[PDB]
Scaffold this active site. Structure first.
Site, PDB file in Angstrom:
ATOM      1  N   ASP A 339     -10.061  -0.074  -2.481  1.00  0.00           N
ATOM      2  CA  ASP A 339      -9.405   0.569  -1.618  1.00  0.00           C
ATOM      3  C   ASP A 339      -9.716   1.709  -1.037  1.00  0.00           C
ATOM      4  OD1 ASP A 339      -5.966   1.747  -1.248  1.00  0.00           O
ATOM      5  OD2 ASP A 339      -7.623   3.126  -1.539  1.00  0.00           O
ATOM      6  N   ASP A 684      -2.231  -1.139  -4.522  1.00  0.00           N
ATOM      7  CA  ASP A 684      -3.189  -1.512  -5.180  1.00  0.00           C
ATOM      8  C   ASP A 684      -2.529  -1.957  -6.878  1.00  0.00           C
ATOM      9  OD1 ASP A 684      -4.740  -0.604  -3.065  1.00  0.00           O
ATOM     10  OD2 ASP A 684      -5.217   1.331  -4.181  1.00  0.00           O
TER      11      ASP A 684
END
Ligand SMILES: COCCO[C@@H]1c2ccn3c(C)c(C)nc3c2N[C@H](c2ccccc2)[C@H]1O
Ligand SMILES: *[C@@H]1O[C@H](CO)[C@@H](O)[C@H](O)[C@H]1NC(C)=O
Ligand SMILES: *[C@@H]1O[C@H](CO)[C@@H](O)[C@H](O)[C@H]1NC(C)=O
Ligand SMILES: *[C@@H]1O[C@H](CO)[C@@H](O)[C@H](O)[C@H]1NC(C)=O
Ligand SMILES: [Mg+2]
Ligand SMILES: [Rb+]
Ligand SMILES: [Rb+]
Lengths: 987, 260
Positions: A339, A684
């Site tokens: 991420d 995430d």
């Protein structure tokens, strides 16, 4: 559920749906009723965690399943024997009882080792309930965010955390931080108008976990708790079922090998038992004997403490893991999916560049101030630093002098906070510095005026005049600027500068950076004397003809240690990919600033813009890099995904949904790679759980990402992943060193049993005696191999192939079992027959002598010298051949542990005594080996008796023979990679 | 798995490896079987005191239990038959390869004087017992209710049980003192002695035609129809008759129930 049409409704419809008022809020009674109906406005935690069942799982696994099966076979062998008439010996019971004992003690060990890991992350969590300013019955008061109910009327300010999922009614320039839900690092603007149909993108909805950066807004709550945009993501993340770790996969592989060998030996030695005249029941007992022998009683304990030490190594570096299995995953990992906002970047708007003296200066964007600052010497710098320090209303919170400036909490807008932390670093005591210049007028940012301005009295009375400071959009401050400071003078702003100014403005704009224009002017003390009453409605002070100060640009910059950590992983052979929800241009910018995309690599969109060719003509294979946005990914097909996935190695994904992160990992795992993902936000958490290992930031990490992770970086130091792989890569090599050590000993204990069956000689080895070896004398040396340093440059090797390179394989087990255990078996027999002959029994007498040996009725059996022994006396002789076979193992094991120190290099190269802990473990192998023998009374407590010093030296030649044999083997392979030796004699 | 041409070449390696190790083993046992002396044990570390056996050696569970009915010949026919087939080697016709021992003290042979470099061994025939020899009573006293139990010790190379006097067996009950008198036995030879010229033993190779000395314990006092336990201790200086981890260390205990 209810949000799909919430934002598209007229207010009159909303106050009907929720029976509320857009200006006065719910009735206190109804707002209390709704709380009972829908529950608290909070998130369901995992509600299936009984304390006693988490213990139960710790008892499962590849070794545990084998250990239970071996234990069960002992009982149904004991029952089969007890019926057939054996008199009150419980080695069946000792063995099975001690077999489950390690499974329990290891289970307790792991249960505490995760109870502490889960308790120290809980020590890191902010534990004060978030507040919410709500309006009910036309009263604006503050209550805890959890008490909000669907339909409530709420309000927000700068620094306020968004309390729930809210539909915007009015908003005066309010912008919010959506970095937890989306990858967006640019502050999103919220307006009461329907920007889009998808509630994820429209501007009239504020999300549950988000942060209001500046402005103020009001609106109605549309969904609360698990029903919010956040709650559904966590509901999705919980629905994700995580795969089994590769380490557990590898151990489950060799138990399939152990059982494959065990049932073969048992069956093939059972079918010969009937052929020597054994009872169908008894012969089956020997088969069960053989399979029980093949299971390593101490392997499970030895492995868990090998992994317990590396978890200690990682927890030493503020890298905490939940389960020991994940401690090894990084070393095996082949692909990383990271991420961007928060994980790669700091997710903190910081000043990056400045323009002054006709030059763009790059600021130091690190958090520890480890990079390079700019030229802080010019006269214009001191003027520019003044304007940015003075024309700034933000303020540090009380008592933060110890925590570092970047991590400080500031009351202020998004850009004002960054400009504040800038001046506090470059100058120090910025807010104390700016209080030396009193304010006399101000105009905050406004739509009609388009800028912010304030006039200040100077520091010393020697200058009675006043100073005007202004900041705003670079193009809107220039229209009011007549001159510019350059190199110690003030030059007229002629056409040369205006064309040279906008190039810099548009130069830094292409970087995706927020840029603000600054200017100043000194008010004449004769036209404006001390005490002049500046009126704002009738602007009686110059709002034009200012002197341009400079340009300051800000961006969400990368974290300090990540731009090199990514480099150190790609040099380790790991394919690194970025997966973020932020817009592509900002994504590819960071992808190059950190090393995801190399110096001199272009996407297909970059070749068309270089060759000036349509993108259709651009050849695909020529592109090393490529960015796939979320919209362009949905219309793709899994066969297309693999096509581009391994066509462009420097891959980037932008504008991706949390699911679109999950599918990518699956498409990577479905291709054979073991994937690790690093993240902080709830977007995430789903992809974090499905990954073979999930890294989460200890500070920036959201709760869902933290809970659905396998490893936590306490200080958010991304550079602890590179050390994560070497400790993972070390243990993998250090396990198949230590694992093979405790497997070789299995042959020498079995072989005496299966010749005692086929040859019917007196029992050479005891069942309880193999327990003191498996569980007491060889565990301490076995774990010492975890302290073996890398034989190769372990950080430069490619990630191991999951199929070929295995913890154990046919070359490993077959060599260890059937070549070194073979040499060890002969040391036992050699030391068996001497203890027989030297005590009275010749070799050829022992053959077929066993039925007389165990006969409780023969009390005058004739030895080879004719002497008559009673049953108890020859029993002691049996106890003696027990302990001489026992020591014959240990002397060979001290040569087995050293030869397992290295797998390729000679022990003379690295030295014998590299491992301080291995030698201090070997000393204790012989200390209790000398205790179990010469301790008074043990002849009857156990089957150990004091042997004289002659039989100690008998197996020593064998120990040196295995020293040289593998030395030759290891030395031969390292000097010459034989096209026959490397593939076979190498494990 | 492996290729079909290296399967055999890999196979030869294991065969070539096993034969090397097995060859080294054969080189070690042959040296081992040449390290030792054919006429004397090297250590004999557990034969600190000798063990005692008994006939008829009949066990139930928990050791020797002997119960028989005097009126029923089938309950003791196999007891004497074991005694008879035991003494078949204690006859002059089968004990020819031994000499007329009358020295009455340790028979220390420093040299080997016999055919094929053998040694002299003493004689012990069945007639040494005078009532438990099988003649005149082939029931060995069982039919009378006074059964003979022959007692004999284990043979240990160069072991000496004492200079003072002959080691004598002493059989008795595990005291049931008040109800009933103590056991009365007549031993054969009288006083229950083992002649000292039967010591020491020099080995089955040294004395191929050796045989143990015996004494019989004709139980006379035992009552009928009662379970009684008899212990037969050997009484000498160099003998320990009570070791908890070996109940047959210088002693024998057995259950006896004579029923009529
Ligand atoms: C010790 O005196 C009593 C006999 O003990 C037996 C026994 C003895 C020795 N052993 C050795 C050296 C090995 C490698 N194995 C055994 C083993 N195994 C037997 C068994 C019991 C239950 C399940 C499977 C096998 C067990 O009864
Ligand atoms: C052995 O000697 C003893 C003592 O003189 C004697 O009684 C016996 O008859 C002798 N036996 C033989 C076979 O000569
Ligand atoms: C032993 O035999 C003699 C001679 O036959 C006999 O007089 C004597 O009573 C016997 N002893 C016993 C205890 O029967
Ligand atoms: C002994 O045997 C006889 C004949 O078989 C029998 O009558 C008698 O009852 C037996 N004695 C006992 C105690 O059973
Ligand atoms: Mg995030
Ligand atoms: Rb075993
Ligand atoms: Rb996981």
């Amino acid at each position: 559920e209810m949000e799909i049409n919430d934002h598209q409704l007229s207010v009159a419809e909303l106050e009907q749906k929720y029976q509320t008022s857009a200006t006065k809020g719910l009735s206190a009674s109804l707002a209390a009723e709704l709380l009972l109906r829908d529950g608290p406005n909070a998130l369901r935690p995992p509600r299936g965690t009984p304390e006693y069942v988490k213990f139960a799982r710790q008892l499962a696994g590849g070794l545990q399943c084998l250990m239970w099966v071996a234990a069960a076979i002992c009982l149904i062998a004991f029952a089969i024997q007890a019926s057939e008439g054996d008199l009150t010996t419980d080695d069946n019971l000792y063995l099975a009882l001690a077999l489950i004992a390690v499974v329990v003690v290891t289970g307790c060990f792991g249960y505490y080792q995760e109870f502490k890991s889960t308790n120290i992350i809980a020590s890191f969590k902010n534990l004060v309930p978030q507040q919410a300013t709500v309006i009910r019955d036309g009263d604006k008061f503050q209550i805890n965010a959890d008490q909000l109910v669907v339909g409530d009327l709420v309000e927000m300010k700068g620094g306020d955390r968004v309390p729930a999922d809210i539909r915007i009614l009015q908003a005066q320039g309010c912008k919010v931080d959506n970095s937890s839900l989306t990858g967006e690092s640019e502050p999103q603007t919220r307006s009461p108008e329907c920007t889009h149909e998808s509630p994820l993108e429209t501007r009239n909805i504020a999300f549950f976990s988000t942060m209001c950066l500046e402005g103020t807004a009001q609106g109605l709550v549309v969904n609360t708790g698990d029903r919010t945009i956040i709650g559904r993501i966590a509901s999705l993340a919980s629905g994700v079922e995580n795969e089994k770790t590769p380490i557990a996969i590898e151990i489950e592989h060799f138990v399939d090998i152990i059982a494959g060998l065990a049932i073969l030996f048992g069956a093939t030695f059972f079918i010969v038992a009937m052929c020597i005249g054994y009872t169908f029941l008894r012969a089956m007992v020997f088969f069960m004997a053989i399979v029980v022998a093949y299971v390593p009683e101490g392997l499970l304990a030895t492995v868990t403490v090998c992994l317990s030490l590396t978890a200690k190594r990682l927890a030493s570096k503020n890298c905490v893991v939940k389960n020991l299995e994940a401690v090894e995953t990084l070393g095996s990992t082949s692909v990383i999916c990271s991420d961007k906002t928060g994980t790669l970047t700091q997710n903190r708007m910081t000043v990056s560049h400045l323009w002054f003296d006709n030059h763009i200066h790059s600021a130091d964007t690190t958090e520890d101030q480890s990079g390079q600052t700019f030229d802080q010497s010019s006269e214009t710098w001191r003027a520019l630093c003044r304007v940015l320090t003075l024309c700034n209303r933000a303020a540090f919170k009380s008592g933060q002098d110890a925590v570092p400036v970047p991590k400080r909490i500031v009351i202020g807008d998004a850009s004002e906070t960054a400009l504040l932390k800038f001046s506090e670093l470059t100058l120090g005591n910025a807010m104390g510095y700016r209080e030396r210049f009193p304010k006399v007028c101000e105009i905050p940012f406004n739509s009609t005026n388009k800028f912010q301005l304030s006039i200040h009295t100077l520091e010393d009375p020697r200058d009675p005049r006043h100073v005007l400071v202004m900041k705003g959009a670079p193009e809107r401050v220039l229209e009011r600027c007549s001159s510019i400071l350059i190199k110690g003078q003030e030059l007229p702003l002629d056409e040369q500068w205006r064309e040279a100014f906008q190039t810099a403005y548009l130069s830094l704009g292409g970087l995706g950076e927020r840029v603000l224009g600054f200017c100043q002017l000194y008010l004449s003390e004769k036209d404006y004397p001390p005490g002049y009453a500046f009126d704002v409605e009738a602007m009686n002070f110059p709002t034009s003809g200012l002197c341009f100060a400079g340009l300051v640009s800000m961006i969400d910059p990368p974290r300090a240690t990540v731009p090199d950590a990514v480099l150190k992983c790609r040099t380790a052979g790991i394919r690194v990919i970025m997966v973020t929800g932020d817009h592509p241009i900002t994504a590819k910018a960071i992808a190059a600033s950190v090393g995801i995309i190399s110096e001199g690599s272009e996407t297909v969109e970059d070749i068309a813009a270089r060759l000036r060719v349509p993108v259709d003509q651009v050849n695909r294979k020529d592109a090393r890099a490529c960015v796939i946005n979320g919209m362009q990914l949905k219309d793709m097909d899994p066969s297309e995904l693999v096509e581009a996935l391994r066509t462009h190695p420097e891959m980037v994904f932008a504008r991706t949904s949390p699911q679109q992160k999950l599918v990518i990992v699956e498409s990577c795992q479905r291709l054979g790679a073991i994937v690790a993902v690093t993240g902080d936000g709830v977007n995430d958490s789903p992809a974090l759980k499905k990954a073979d290992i999930g890294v989460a930031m200890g500070i920036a990490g959201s709760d869902a990402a933290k809970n659905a992770a396998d490893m936590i970086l306490l200080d958010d130091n991304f550079a602890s992943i590179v050390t994560g792989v070497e400790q993972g890569r070390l243990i993998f090599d250090n396990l198949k060193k230590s694992i093979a050590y405790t497997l070789t000993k299995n042959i020498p204990e079995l072989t005496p049993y299966l010749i005692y069956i086929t040859v019917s000689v007196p029992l050479p080895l005891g069942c309880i005696t193999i327990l003191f070896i498996e569980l007491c004398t060889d565990i301490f040396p076995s774990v010492s191999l975890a302290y073996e340093k890398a034989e190769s440059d372990i950080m430069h090797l490619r990630p191991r192939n999951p199929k070929r390179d295995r913890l154990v394989n046919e070359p490993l087990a077959a060599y260890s079992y059937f070549q070194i255990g073979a040499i060890q078996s002969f040391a036992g027999f050699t030391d068996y027959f001497t203890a027989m002959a030297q005590e009275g029994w010749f070799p050829l007498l022992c053959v077929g002598l066993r039925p007389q040996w165990e006969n409780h009725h023969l009390q005058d059996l004739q030895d080879s010298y004719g002497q008559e022994w009673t049953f108890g006396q020859r029993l002691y002789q049996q106890y003696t051949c027990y302990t001489v076979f026992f020591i014959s193992i240990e002397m060979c094991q001290i040569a087995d542990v050293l030869i397992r120190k290295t797998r390729r290099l000679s022990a003379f190269q690295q030295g014998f005594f590299r491992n301080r802990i291995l030698v201090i473990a070997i000393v204790f192998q012989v200390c209790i080996g000398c205790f179990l023998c010469y301790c008074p009374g043990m002849p009857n407590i156990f089957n150990f008796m004091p042997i004289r010093f002659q039989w100690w030296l008998v197996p020593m030649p064998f120990s040196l023979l295995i020293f040289v044999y593998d030395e030759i083997r290891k030395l031969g392979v390292r000097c010459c990679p034989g096209s026959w030796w490397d593939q076979e004699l190498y494990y | 798995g492996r290729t079909l041409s290296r399967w055999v070449w890999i196979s030869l390696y294991y065969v070539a490896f096993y034969v090397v190790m097995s060859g080294i083993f054969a080189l070690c046992i042959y040296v081992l079987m040449r390290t030792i002396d054919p006429y004397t044990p090297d250590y004999q570390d557990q034969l600190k005191s000798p063990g005692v056996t008994l006939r008829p050696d009949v066990y139930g569970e928990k050791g020797l239990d002997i119960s028989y009915n005097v009126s029923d010949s089938t309950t003791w026919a196999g007891l004497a038959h074991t005694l008879h087939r035991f003494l078949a080697g204690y006859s002059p016709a089968a004990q020819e390869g031994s000499i007329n021992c009358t020295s009455e003290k340790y028979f220390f042979q420093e040299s080997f004087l016999a055919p094929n470099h053998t040694k002299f061994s003493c004689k012990f025939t069945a007639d040494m017992l005078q009532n438990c020899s099988g003649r005149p009573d082939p029931t060995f006293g069982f039919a009378e209710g006074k059964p003979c139990f022959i007692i004999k010790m284990n043979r240990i190379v160069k072991f000496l049980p004492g200079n003072s006097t002959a080691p004598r067996v002493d059989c008795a009950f595990l005291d049931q003192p008040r109800d009933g008198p103590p056991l009365q036995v007549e031993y054969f030879p009288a006083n229950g002695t083992y002649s000292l010229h039967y010591f020491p033993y020099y080995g089955k190779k040294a004395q191929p035609h050796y045989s143990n000395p015996l004494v019989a314990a004709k139980l006379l006092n035992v009552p009928r129809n009662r379970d009684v336990v008899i212990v037969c201790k050997i009484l000498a200086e160099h003998v320990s008759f009570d070791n908890p981890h070996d109940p047959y260390e210088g002693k024998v205990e057995f259950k006896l129930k004579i029923q009529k």
